[model samples]
Target: EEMLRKAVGKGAYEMAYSQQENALWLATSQSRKLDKGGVVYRLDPVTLEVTQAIHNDLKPFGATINNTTQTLWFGNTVNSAVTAIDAKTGEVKGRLVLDDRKRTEEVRPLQPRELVADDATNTVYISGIGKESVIWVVDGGNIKLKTAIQNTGKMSTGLALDSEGKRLYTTNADGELITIDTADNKILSRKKLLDDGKEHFFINISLDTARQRAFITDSKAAEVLVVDTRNGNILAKVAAPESLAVLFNPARNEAYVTHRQAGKVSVIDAKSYKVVKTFDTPTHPNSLALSADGKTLYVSVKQKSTKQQEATQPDDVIRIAL
Candidate 1:
């Protein structure tokens, strides 16, 4: 229960952990209540100190790192693109524009969601948010959009991958779980969870690959679903009010969920499928990242500012020993 907290500049967003470089990556924006381009800080994993900052034209909202290619790929929200940077040197590598549809004819823009990659294959996938959304498949080695995945359900938000198994998993606002096989860049299927006669907005997804399970966050319902990925069964629905992000730590057999709306983070025991611990962030606990050994957890806590004056204070970064 030894947790360390440090206050950083406000507008905290997403995070990524780099094993090859032995560093923690934290993304913070300059704009609050809206997405904007900002700096990505390379931080010391142990003391939570800033080591380097990467400034680029693109926003660093959603990030994922590929060790094999030594690349840090981040999604630029509302800008319709993702950028790849050299993790070791903090240099810009490349950017992929994901807007395929006509912008003038459309109303809502197709923005990029989460960026995740398989280190072994050097392949990255970034989900596009829209009614008929698409997942952009990027080649890490070349740092370009190789292709796009079609027919993802309504508002695909969170993405997870079974890297070694060739299976990629994603959840949607429609409460459906979609699977894509990376072998041929084809979607396997979209399975709907057990309906409870209520609306569901599944935000983020984490996988228990050992047992073929997915921990999906349903923010609309204020619940965290433990689903059997093989059959789309809702095995358990743990109450995690306003859950936004989820990460499964296989090393400890635990799943951590951030409730941005509730200002708390809940830890669930994978075996029991229940919330075993809760940490109060008091503001908005936005995202999660874990150390290489899964012994420590990092979180980006954004200030839940309503009045214009409340945002003057900086946001926070929390490190929890698991």
Candidate 2:
């Protein structure tokens, strides 16, 4: 709490679901297991306290709130399902099950990384990396299956959308980026990136609407790849140690890249395409979230004394300043 207040100049308080008096509900595993996790936090800005919110047995790997629907859509990566929770009451409203489990045996494994909302349409695009061979789309709470119009070389690890233009972008385990046209269900183009200027195995991307660029993390290559959306071209590549995850703050034209191996976060200027600063962080930062006001970032970090323990250990949800 002292460290948090010093960095962000704000007070801090933490409490779990059962004790968080403000939380309407909480998300947890069926048995309250350590790693088989849950989410139950809501910030009370006026009080600077994080109150518990919702609780469920659904293993929420990633989550994004739908402001319009007053609900939250979270991914159950292990189960290959998306659960909708009432934002105000913390009730399980519905679950959208991905119907590609049968194909995993022949194609590939299935797991979701991130969940994004197309504000204009109230639709959700869930990135199922394991099933990069396929794409899942949900509209009006109705799911529709579409053959992945991209990722022939390998599977996708991340996905983002510019719904107004109907453009979608994805990162492949093959060290390449692909853009798609949702209207035609076709890949617009794929930009091949040379991993570390030698091999080819990099993936993770964030789309910046304000600057019209995609910020990608090259985990194997140890760098951040910036690309031009207009032409699907590489704009700049900046170095970071074990850059495993990335995100863009559209309002500031800045990109946040995480160095999972070193437990740090790198901030870059999107327009200049250069690293401006770096900060020490928790271990294995793989995902990031920015508040609407753009002053806070919630980073997902993983740490363990050994590989075996890591598989079961719940990732550290590191809350940090902009």
TM-score of each model, paired residue for residue: 0.94, 0.80
RMSD of 2: 5.8
The 10-residue segment of model 1 with minimum total lDDT is 28-37
Per-residue lDDT, model 2, residue 78, is: 62
Query: lDDT tens string, model 1, 1-322?
Result: 7888987666677888878789988877656455346788888888888889787677678988887777888888857888888888898988877884456755677899898889888999999988977788988877777888987878998898888788998888787889999898898988878567777888899988889998998878867889888888788978768789999999999999998878889999988878999998778899999998999999899876764655877778999988
* Candidate 2, residue 203: how far the Cα is off, in Å: 2.9
- Model 2, range 173-274, lDDT digits (tens) per residue? 777777778777678787776534665445667787766888877666766778888886788978667676677887777888777678788889876777
Task: Output the number of the TM-score-best candidate.
Answer: 1
**Once superposed on the true structure, which residue ranges of model 1 sit more than 4 Å away at CA?**
32-36, 100-105, 306-310
